[PDB]
Amino acid sequence: MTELCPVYAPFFGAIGCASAIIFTSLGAAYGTAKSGVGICATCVLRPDLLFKNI
Amino acid sequence: ASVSEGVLRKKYTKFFQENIKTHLDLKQALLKEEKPETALLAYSLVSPSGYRGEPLTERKILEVVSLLDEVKVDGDTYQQLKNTFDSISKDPRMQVSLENQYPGKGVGLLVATGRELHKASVNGDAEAYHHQLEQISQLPGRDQRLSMPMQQTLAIGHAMLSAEGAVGATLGMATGYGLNNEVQDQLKQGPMSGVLPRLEISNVKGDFTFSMQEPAAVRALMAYLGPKEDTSMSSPQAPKEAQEMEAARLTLKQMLGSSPNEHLVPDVDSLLKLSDEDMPSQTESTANGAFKKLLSEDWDWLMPAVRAMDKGEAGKINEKLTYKLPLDAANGRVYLDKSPNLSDAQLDALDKLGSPSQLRLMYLAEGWI
């Protein structure tokens, strides 16, 4: 196309637009999984603290 | 207390040593002692069918059902069964029961596989329902001469139909025999059924003879013992032919454990409903739903619930059946318990049945209730 605007240029934008939601979803999934295992182990004895620990 | 079989083919091996291939000239070889009148009684199992309509007349299992017809010690319990059979074989009512179980005597691959995985699972449940039913008649108060071999025959018959379900499902899935004879040879190992008399039938359609170690003649015998007596056929108003075939009918129905008040009409059909007047009377309808709960909540709950009911203790069923199993949780082993949650409405209905008759439990194991 142009030397300033080549044809391979939207590849980096598509990779960034994917990688944002990908790595934030991995972080949110680890946080939700670890905290949910903690809540389900805790709230067998104290079910009244269930909606406080959310 | 009522049955004790064996498998010793070497104690009386003289009857099976030589190549005896004739039904005639075998009673002299079956004497073998100074006893004559009681050695003819063990020969009476195969003697009315010893000449008419059979192939080769001595199959290799027809002697072991005649050798182990042990009348040497006791000659009373089998004679009472022989006085009752062929006295039961006179009415058409037994004969019309012996004609209902008989004839006259792509996406289509997912469907045909599912029709035969259903066949392998229904017959695998119903085979297990007779294994925990041959230890209910082991309890005190029952009997084992008529109850045991009647339902050992059915558990062999459901093991073959369950094997034909998934052998056929394998050869249809791997395509779209010799395996059925390998499992037929396998189920004749170990124990073997006790000897019941022959149940010959003679009428205008011919002279027939069934076997009673076939699962289809057993299945038609219990359909005959079902319904209650009527106002006729047991009164002395009709001494014609009834009291020798009705008192023979009631002495087997009592021999299972069913009183003559108990009706027990079967259910299987191609129709919607059955009738109006032979319905169960809501005390046993509530109780039959409690037994079906005990069959399908555990593999081991039907025997200690009948055992708890013969003692009149059928209100403590919720507590005498509870046991604890472990469970890996997120906090460790917890050891929770499994209890049959019988409601109070169907815990009361198990009291008004004093003891479950063995005929009621065998209709339940066949899906007829």
Curated annotation (Swiss-Prot), chain A:
Belongs to the V-ATPase proteolipid subunit family. V-ATPase is a heteromultimeric enzyme composed of a peripheral catalytic V1 complex (components A to H) attached to an integral membrane V0 proton pore complex (components: a, c, c', c'', d, e, f and VOA1). The decameric c-ring forms the proton-conducting pore, and is composed of eight proteolipid subunits c, one subunit c' and one subunit c''. Residues 32-53 are cytoplasmic. It is found in: Vacuole membrane. This is V-type proton ATPase subunit c. The lineage of its organism: Eukaryota, Fungi, Dikarya, Ascomycota, Saccharomycotina. The chain holds residues 1 to 54 of 160 of the full protein. The chain crosses the membrane at residues 9-31. Proton-conducting pore forming subunit of the V0 complex of vacuolar(H+)-ATPase (V-ATPase), a multisubunit enzyme composed of a peripheral complex (V1) that hydrolyzes ATP and a membrane integral complex (V0) that translocates protons. V-ATPase is responsible for acidifying and maintaining the pH of intracellular compartments. Present with 8450 molecules/cell in log phase SD medium. It comes from the Eukaryota. Residues 1-8 are vacuolar.
